[PDB]
Write a protein that binds this ligand. Structure first.
Ligand SMILES: Nc1ncnc2c1ncn2[C@@H]1O[C@H](COP(=O)(O)OP(=O)(O)O)[C@@H](O)[C@H]1O
Ligand SMILES: Nc1ncnc2c1ncn2[C@@H]1O[C@H](COP(=O)(O)OP(=O)(O)O)[C@@H](O)[C@H]1O
Ligand SMILES: Nc1ncnc2c1ncn2[C@@H]1O[C@H](COP(=O)(O)OP(=O)(O)O)[C@@H](O)[C@H]1O
Ligand code: BEF
Ligand code: BEF
Ligand code: BEF
Ligand SMILES: [Mg+2]
Ligand SMILES: [Mg+2]
Ligand SMILES: [Mg+2]
Ligand SMILES: [Zn+2]
Ligand SMILES: [Zn+2]
Lengths: 343, 363, 248, 185, 373, 366
DNA sequence: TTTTTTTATGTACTCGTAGTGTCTGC
DNA sequence: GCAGACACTACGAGTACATA
């Protein structure tokens, strides 16, 4: 219930165990390595038998068998590692968890692992009853701007030297995909145990395998950088989200931006953003975005976008995903189109 | 007659040692440095594209982890267990074709042999090729085996589309990513292969084969088998010229370049190529329109795209700036009108012919 | 649901209906385009309650005399109703009262009356389907033929369980093939005399027929390779079966 | 090449086939593992069936004339051939070229085989503890402590019996977890 | 003898020797050279449009491989194995109708049975037809077997759209593309078929059938059978022309020349003649558009006219020389708009009449005069 | 409970004999020649617009293939096999509602039992109706059976349009294009049917029903059955004129002349009056296009008017005299485009108003 | 820090479950 | 006998994918 960060969960792990542990937060790899650290700490301590249970609706609780009966040949305590569903559990499972805690033995440990829960799921009967002694901890992957420091810190922990150019190429190639980042770090360490990597082969042992959620796409398109936007779209290949999500995203911000430009003659852009708290990390990134445009520019953007909107859904076009390449690139160096398209 | 069955060059020239693997310096060197020392993760995931060496490299790890000498980055040459793995039969390596074994009623049984004693030689090691076809419950069984793997065993793993695996097993496995071969790598390897047995070869045929291989080495070997077949035991420029009808790609830019003037036989040759190739005429004209639109974009901006056709950044630019924007707009009007009316022409080839004739009618 | 007219009453042990259905159930259509082909035809005659089932390529007709005057009436009952009716048969001592209507079939068993909806169609004339000339006729031991056909079929083609009879003078030769070529040959001593002949046909169907009737000595009748085979028991003529050949 | 000659009876062939082909159900990785190895050596038939984990070998006396050899037969098909034949009938077998022909007088079948060289065998070893236990005693040992096994457990060794020996006595440990069982015969 | 059975031209005339093929060179030569040099690759896919020979070429190659004598490029028509594959249901050729075998539950069984040795001949030929219909799991299952099959197994894969296959399958096996046939080859094949059939024929009808076959030989053979039925057992230009709906009647060149010469009365007369002939109007418009297109192509380059169109070549050349390109484009656009508006015209004859009239009155050199002011 | 249930004309008068079929001379001649001469084929697909008779031709061919007389060009009609096919009981004619039975599962099921010999008939005809709604897997499953079926099985395909079929199947059957039936054939067939059915009819009413059906026996016959409900027992000219919404009056050319002279008020008044009277709008624009065609035709070549046109020549020739040749085609194109967009308009009257305003926008000076 | 928002129809595959044939030392 | 094994086969659901 404490709702702390794993940098402190390590501290509570070093001290006396605070009964059941619940580590949450959507994690690429940090959840698994935190689980591994918990496993090794427990193995050093009493609890050694890690029984893996997948918490899911429509799946009966075989954990009661461990809960009601104690181990007989090697007790050695034991730990129940629970895997939560990606949407959270239901009331039946939440109350059966409380029943299990009622069946808890002194050598039993409860570990609940999952993603962020809903408020009712968070404040269920089991969590409420365990709020007296259990702990809660959450973590999330670093952002784009927070990546270089994290990568450098991990490199310094692993006793391998990095460089600014190497960090740049890593944060470009592996942006938010820490599993790939960790594998690349291990590969660069094992390839050359010299301990000096500046830019000799870091690209040779690093591919383009990273996640890219749509919110950053306009962040490039608002500068109108042709090569950068084209490279971002090429990076989006092989993890290709269906076009509808990207289309919804850019229609959202373009409707917001056209409303902003309509109201620009009225109350200034900052106090207008006061209504448009879309948390674009300052609401000022949109402020520098709106600096480079024109009303005719917005017309040329919206015509192509709305033509695509019927180009993929009215007749089910197959090039429409590649059309996202077409629409984003043409806006980069189009101050205003002299009609000739006006879709 | 029924003698001299030259089996495929894909199978005959299959690498036997790490020195016979073309390209992929990073994977080779990484595993070489990892084999001398004992830091071996219990599961090695290999991923790449069509026909590169993932399966070959996996055979090489089965060769290396199991030998009389021991765990060696260097090859073995000849020693019983690794000798046995040159052919199919081998006792402590079992190759589960995961495509044929997807259900748990099979893969649970196969993984249930992990707790048996290993056969002759240490490191009971099995190669589950094409892992992306395992069922969800099969992946759960694999995960339960990976979380508490027996120390005396390891097992490799391969795929082609790594995005289909669960994040748990991907995070657990020490994934190596195997890169697509570059054109020079494939060309030199094919040169070596042809020189090895008996077949004469000219260089242009080999550049053409490498270009048409699209990067996969197995693809290059299949095309060299076809080239040998068509060329009657000689891969000369003529058999690969017959292949040139398939590997000839750059066609949409040449017609755009020839539209702005009367080049004579260029338009006729290009339409003959398009008809004999039979590509989508609607897509052909859409590519025409896209090229013309980015040209108009460059007219109002001296470097509007830059990354467009880096190989044609010395000819496309001339028509990107020399041609008046009014002519570009008129050509766009002509091509748009042609596309709008294209399906209603007697034939789409006739329609694209008429679009070209209308474009050539004005200037 | 209300009562119906054209309602003839039956009085018969459940064993009679069980024998009838078990005689003509294995050859009833299952999810076929011919919609009338599903279910069984119950036809009333002054002699028996004849029943007809067919897939278009297995025509099984059973005729158990009932001992009551029956006005001529032809009915088709769907697959579901037939299965349920067969499930409700047991004991063999209670008299089953079968009540026919224009659009429904009811039946009183013991103390409960159950009903089933009735397929709307015109069933084919089975008598024309039955061959018009039994010029080539042979008799053979039922269990011997059944055992021989099982032996031959164990190597038969999986998807198309097809064997071939070769009938010569007092001899039946069963030949079966399959993908991954395997040949099964078996010779039976039969009571046959006539023209030499060969005919390919499904073996699952014939094994099913022999399982259904299971007499002492069967006899089949047939003319030509394309001609369908009409199999019945040599003791009586109450049950007849028609199997359509493979090949052509 | 090889051409073996079987001349056997059903009653002395049904049970060995059952004991050698019981566990051979399902689809094995090598197709030969789904096959049953027939060896005719001296006046002896050796029927072998494997699953890469256990081998069943049945020995059948060959009183009638025979020819030595080695081949492999689809186990299910051969068992269904031997089964269902008339009681007391004689099965004769000749493996010609590629296919193996079985005959029971009025019946003949031609089954496809696989070369005997492909069939795997378990290498010889040294048997440390060899004994001739009474069959009933072993049956008691198994049954009195087999109800507790803990099949499908994470330990990956709790799933199997343990056998311990000392002098003229032995015990069977039923590794189960919350259950233990032992038997001292 | 003539063997009067009258059983489908297509099936009767499937090629049986290596030479009866219609004239695919780049694949027949490669296959023959491979079989002669001993390079018998274990898996290769035939692609190409419908009815070119790929399913036939596969059968010929299986015949060649499993011949009784040594491997010969030209199979014999006398040995037991060649006769059996000739008659179908051959022992060692497993022809798998993959469109009926798409479940992985059957491809797994296939790969289970692949190991057992064949009984006759040398190889067992797995002719998997319509490969592109196999379900994805079946393809992945086939992958490992295709990479390294046993010594005695060859996979004859044939399909129509190879791009549907997973790219790894394309990598595993060779790729032979069968080009759609030319008009000369297909017309020669039709001449051979009709001459051996002892059926009288007219050259114009054969040229019509070749033109309408769209370069696929089975289309031409089916059309030939349909024309044989259409006539009284003889192939005639009149029967083929009336059955195809073509406008060889009164050509179409008269109509287009009346268009360019702006004679409304001539256009009306030709329209009335066609209406009495009961022709379909959209075909007439398509013919006019094609004539305009060929005129423009000849104006760019005189060698654009086809040899099948060598009947009216002088007037074609004259019209190419006279009419400026712009007028040709205007006619083409007007007639194309007319064809687009035909379904929405009050009547097809009336719509075509007004399309002709519009393309006439807008002719710049001779427009329809304004009536009074 | 009438005779079965076909008291409707659409089912009662489906032909039972090649002699009883109307039109389709080419395909009937081809089928008769094939049947009698011996050149038979295993796969015919009949493609044509709706209500032309592809299903009827297919069933009649199935009769002709399995008549006890032999392979006869004209089916017996009285023999037992023809009677059974009429009843639908015939166990070898396997009709398929391919629009309803689309799953590839059922196609595979019906292909597995193709090897069986026919129960009673010579040929096991697989009549498939509405083939174009087979799932792509079903189309490709039919391939190897369509190409080389056994000697005894013959396929019949009856599709509304041929171009939706894969080019593989389209290249393995005889494509018989059923030519759409012209007005005179419809009129003669309708008159013969009505004379057989003993209900009085007027020739001009039958002409209306023919010209409104756009070439379809089923459509025209359904329209006649609709008129019988309205016109009591008789297909009377007045009743069918009111039902069909024909433009009996002369307001068509009146609003034509109002529109070409840019008289917006007059055009709107005429539209309001027509809507009040209860006009139909699609026929209005069809009449517009016809009148414009006549005006243009006499502008090019005089003395081209006929009957009613030759009577209203006093106005038509004046319009051809005052309207330039260029503007006539533009008016015609605008009107036909409006007719194209009539379905894509929430109100039909509003759509016609839109079309007329688009036409008046050519000369919107006042 | 919680934030918008495409379908119908069809085809496969794999995992439970459920119902049923068949038959084995019990 | 025989019920329980034991197999085997069919059906629904959940999921992944395709194509118009
Ligand atoms: N690194 C390599 N060295 C040599 N041959 C290779 C290499 N990579 C691919 N090949 C060729 O391609 C064929 C198939 O290779 P494979 O390793 O199965 O590719 P995949 O990664 O797609 O499973 C091999 O037989 C070999 O000829
Ligand atoms: N190359 C060819 N030579 C002769 N006939 C051909 C050829 N190609 C196609 N045909 C005709 O088409 C019929 C079917 O051809 P088929 O080989 O099935 O084409 P597909 O490649 O589409 O399966 C043959 O019976 C033959 O008459
Ligand atoms: N050629 C024809 N001859 C006679 N009646 C016809 C003809 N075509 C259509 N009909 C009439 O149309 C009705 C439906 O015909 P049908 O053959 O089902 O057309 P479709 O091709 O659209 O299925 C028939 O019952 C018949 O009255
Ligand atoms: F075998 Be590879 F993945 F094409
Ligand atoms: F008719 Be083919 F096989 F496309
Ligand atoms: F086109 Be019809 F109404 F079948
Ligand atoms: Mg591979
Ligand atoms: Mg084919
Ligand atoms: Mg119909
Ligand atoms: Zn070694
Ligand atoms: Zn031969």
């Amino acid at each position: 219930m404490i709702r702390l960060y794993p940098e402190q969960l390590r501290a509570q792990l070093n001290e006396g165990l605070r009964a059941a542990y619940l580590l949450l937060g959507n994690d690429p790899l940090l959840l698994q390595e935190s689980q591994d650290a918990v496993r090794q700490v427990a193995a050093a301590q009493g609890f050694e038998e890690h029984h893996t249970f997948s918490i899911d609706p429509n799946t009966d609780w075989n954990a009661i068998f461990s809960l009601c009966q104690a181990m007989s040949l090697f007790a050695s305590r034991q730990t129940l590692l629970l895997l939560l569903p990606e949407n959270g559990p239901n009331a039946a499972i939440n109350e059966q968890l409380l029943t299990l805690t009622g069946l808890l033995h002194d050598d039993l440990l409860l570990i609940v692992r999952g993603n962020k829960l809903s408020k009712a799921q968070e404040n269920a009967a089991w969590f409420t009853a365990l709020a007296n002694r259990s702990v809660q901890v959450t973590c999330q992957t670093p952002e784009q701007a927070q990546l270089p420091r994290w990568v450098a810190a991990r490199a310094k922990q692993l006793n391998l030297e990095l460089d600014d150019a190497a960090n740049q190429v890593l944060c470009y190639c592996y942006e938010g995909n820490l599993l790939a980042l960790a594998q690349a770090l291990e590969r660069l360490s094992l390839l050359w145990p010299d301990g000096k990597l500046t830019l000799p082969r870091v690209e040779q042992a690093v591919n383009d395998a990273a996640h890219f959620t749509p919110f950053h796409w306009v962040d490039a398109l608002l500068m109108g950088k042709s090569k950068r936007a084209l490279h971002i779209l090429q990076q989006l290949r092989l993890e290709g989200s269906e076009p509808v999500i990207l289309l919804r995203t850019l229609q959202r911000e373009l409707l917001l931006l056209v409303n902003l430009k309509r109201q620009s003659a009225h109350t200034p852009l900052r106090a207008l953003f006061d209504k448009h708290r879309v948390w674009q990390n300052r609401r000022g990134m949109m402020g520098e975005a709106l600096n480079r445009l024109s009303q005719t520019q917005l017309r040329q953007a919206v015509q192509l976008l709305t033509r695509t909107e019927l180009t993929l859904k009215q007749d089910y076009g197959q090039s429409v995903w590649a059309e996202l390449e077409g629409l984003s690139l043409l806006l980069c160096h189009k101050p205003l189109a002299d009609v000739f398209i006006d879709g | 007659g029924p003698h001299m069955s030259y089996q495929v060059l894909a199978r005959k020239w299959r690498p036997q040692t790490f020195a016979d693997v073309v390209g992929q310096e990073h994977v080779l060197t990484a595993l070489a440095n990892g084999l001398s020392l004992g830091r071996i993760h219990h599961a090695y995931l290999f991923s790449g594209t069509r026909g590169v060496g993932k399966t070959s490299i996996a055979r090489l790890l089965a060769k290396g982890l199991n030998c009389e000498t021991g765990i060696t980055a260097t090859p073995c040459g000849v020693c019983d267990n690794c000798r046995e793995i040159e052919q199919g039969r081998f006792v402590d390596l079992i190759e589960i074709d995961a495509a044929s074994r997807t259900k748990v009623e099979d893969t649970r049984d196969l993984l249930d042999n992990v707790q048996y004693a290993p056969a002759r030689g240490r490191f009971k090691v099995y190669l589950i090729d094409e892992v992306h076809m395992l069922s969800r419950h099969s992946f759960n069984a694999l995960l339960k085996t990976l979380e508490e793997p027996p120390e005396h065993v390891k097992f490799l793993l391969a795929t082609t589309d790594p995005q289909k695996l669960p994040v748990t097993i991907l995070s657990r496995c020490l994934q190596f990513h195997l890169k697509a071969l570059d054109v020079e790598q494939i060309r030199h390897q094919l040169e070596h292969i042809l020189n090895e047995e008996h077949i004469a070869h000219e260089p242009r045929a080999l550049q053409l084969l490498a270009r048409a291989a699209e990067g996969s080495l197995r693809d290059a070997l299949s095309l060299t088998d076809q080239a040998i077949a068509s060329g009657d035991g000689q891969v000369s420029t003529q058999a690969v010229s017959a292949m040139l009808g398939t590997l000839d790609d750059d066609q949409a830019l040449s017609l755009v370049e020839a539209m702005v003037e009367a080049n004579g036989e260029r338009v006729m040759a290009l339409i003959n190529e398009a008809a004999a190739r039979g590509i989508e005429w609607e897509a052909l004209l859409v590519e025409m329109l896209g090229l013309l639109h980015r040209i108009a974009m460059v007219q109002l901006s001296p470097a509007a795209l830059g990354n467009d056709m880096a190989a044609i950044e010395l000819r496309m630019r001339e028509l990107a700036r020399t041609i008046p924007p009014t002519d570009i707009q008129l050509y766009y009007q002509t091509l748009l009108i042609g596309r709008k009316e294209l399906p209603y022409a007697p034939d789409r080839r006739m329609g694209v012919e008429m679009t070209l004739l209308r474009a050539l009618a004005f200037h | 649901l209300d009562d119906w007219q054209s309602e003839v009453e039956f009085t018969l042990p459940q064993a009679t209906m069980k024998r009838l259905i078990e005689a003509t159930q294995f050859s009833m259509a299952h999810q076929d385009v011919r919609y009338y082909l599903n279910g069984m035809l119950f036809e009333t005659e002054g002699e028996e309650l004849r029943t007809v089932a067919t897939d278009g390529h297995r025509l099984a007709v059973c005729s158990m005399p009932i001992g009551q005057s029956l006005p001529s009436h032809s009915v088709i009952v769907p697959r579901k109703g037939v299965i349920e009716l067969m499930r409700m048969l047991d004991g063999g001592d209670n008299p089953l009262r079968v009540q026919i209507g224009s659009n429904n079939i009811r039946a009183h068993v013991g103390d409960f009356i159950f009903t089933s909806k009735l397929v709307d169609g015109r069933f084919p004339d089975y008598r024309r389907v039955l061959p018009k000339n039994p010029d080539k006729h042979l008799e053979a031991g039922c269990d011997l033929l059944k055992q021989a056909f099982a032996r031959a079929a164990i190597l038969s083609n999986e998807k198309f369980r097809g064997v071939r009879l070769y009938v010569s003078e007092n001899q039946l030769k069963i030949t079966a093939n399959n993908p991954e070529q395997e040949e099964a040959e078996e010779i039976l001593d039969v009571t046959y005399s006539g023209a030499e002949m060969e005919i390919g046909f499904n073996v699952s169907y014939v094994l099913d027929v022999l399982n259904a009737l299971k007499c002492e000595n069967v006899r089949m009748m047939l003319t030509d390779s394309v001609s369908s085979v009409q199999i019945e028991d040599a003791a009586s003529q109450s049950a007849a079966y028609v199997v359509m050949p493979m090949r052509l | 090449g090889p051409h073996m000659k079987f001349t056997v009876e059903r009653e002395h062939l049904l049970k060995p086939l059952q004991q050698v082909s019981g566990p051979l159900g399902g689809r094995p990785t090598l197709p030969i593992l789904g096959n049953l190895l027939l060896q005719v050596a001296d006046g002896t038939l050796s029927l072998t069936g494997t699953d890469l984990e256990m081998e069943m070998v049945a020995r059948v006396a060959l009183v009638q004339p025979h020819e030595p050899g080695a081949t492999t037969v689809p186990a299910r098909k051969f068992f269904d051939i031997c089964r269902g034949l008339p009681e007391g009938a004689e099965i004769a077998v000749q493996l010609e070229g590629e296919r193996m022909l079985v005959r029971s007088g009025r019946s003949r079948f031609s089954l496809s085989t696989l070369p005997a060289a492909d069939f795997p065998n378990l290498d010889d070893w040294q048997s440390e503890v060899e004994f001739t236990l009474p069959q009933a005693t072993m049956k008691r040992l198994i049954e009195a402590t087999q109800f507790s096994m803990a099949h499908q457990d994470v330990r990956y060794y709790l799933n199997g019996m343990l056998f311990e020996t000392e002098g003229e006595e032995l015990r069977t440990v039923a590794t189960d977890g919350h259950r233990l069982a032992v038997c001292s015969m």
